Amino acid sequence: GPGSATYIFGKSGGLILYTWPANDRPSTRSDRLAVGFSTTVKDGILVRIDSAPGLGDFLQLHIEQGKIGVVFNIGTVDISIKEERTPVNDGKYHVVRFTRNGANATLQVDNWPVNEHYPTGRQLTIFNTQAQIAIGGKDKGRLFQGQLSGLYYDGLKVLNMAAENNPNIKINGSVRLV
Numbered sequence: 001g002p003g004s005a006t007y008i009f010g011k012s013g014g015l016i017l018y019t020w021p022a023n024d025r026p027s028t029r030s031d032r033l034a035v036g037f038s039t040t041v042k043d044g045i046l047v048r049i050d051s052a053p054g055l056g057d058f059l060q061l062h063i064e065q066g067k068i069g070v071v072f073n074i075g076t077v078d079i080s081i082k083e084e085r086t087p088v089n090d091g092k093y094h095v096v097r098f099t100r101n102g103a104n105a106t107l108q109v110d111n112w113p114v115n116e117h118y119p120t121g122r123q124l125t126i127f128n129t130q131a132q133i134a135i136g137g138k139d140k141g142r143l144f145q146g147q148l149s150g151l152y153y154d155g156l157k158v159l160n161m162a163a164e165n166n167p168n169i170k171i172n173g174s175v176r177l178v
């Protein structure tokens with residue numbers, strides 16, 4: 001709601017970084033990711049979850065040519081799902097919702113027709129030993145500029161945790177709680 005923690009990222013970019021305590025690093029067969037955003041950027045990474053060093057697994061929510069999508073890897077090759085029909089960089093508030101079940105995924109913006117992707121043949125299922133949630137894209141040189149609100153990832157309200165000064169959150173660069 002109104003109480004959902006909201007952060008503004010400026011033109012110079014910033015990062016909010018959640019690092020799981022070592023023993024708390026999760027492994028999942030399915031994920032759920034959602035965030036409210038407003039932006040005019042043609043390109044930027046909003047959120048990326050990475051596994052521990054040496055493991056290639058990741059899950060990345062990003063905008064490319066004004067269109068929002070998720071690319072992820074759970075141990076085979078990059079799997080992508082995208083809202084290709086309509087751009088989201090119109091400077092209006094949207095909600096993007098993503099689910100993953102093994103190699104399968106869904107993606108919806110607002111109330112638009114749902115995108116679904118079901119890779120064929122033998123697949124892996126586990127997103128192994130997740131180590132960090134990077135928000136804002138600055139670390140990968142694709143900074144997000146705009147507003148992020150009410151980020152939800154697998155039960156974690158990460159922006160709420162940032163706003164509450166969670167000891168496993170680091171914030172730097174051009175980012176501000178509103």
Ligand SMILES: *[C@@H]1O[C@H](CO[C@@H]2O[C@H](CO)[C@@H](O)[C@H](O)[C@@H]2O)[C@@H](O[C@@H]2O[C@H](CO)[C@@H](O)[C@H](O)[C@H]2NC(C)=O)[C@H](O)[C@H]1NC(C)=O
Pocket residue numbers: 101102103104118125
């Ligand atoms: C990932 O998704 C596959 C395929 O999903 C099935 O096919 C269509 C996709 O076009 C989808 O709309 C249906 O809902 C259906 O689930 C899953 O594989 C299927 O699993 C179901 C339920 O266990 C079986 O009835 C089907 O035989 C089976 N089909 C195939 C082609 O294998 C798969 O389980 C799923 N992966 C995970 C981890 O959930």
Ligand SMILES: [Ca+2]
Pocket residue numbers: 057074075124126127128
């Ligand atoms: Ca894996």
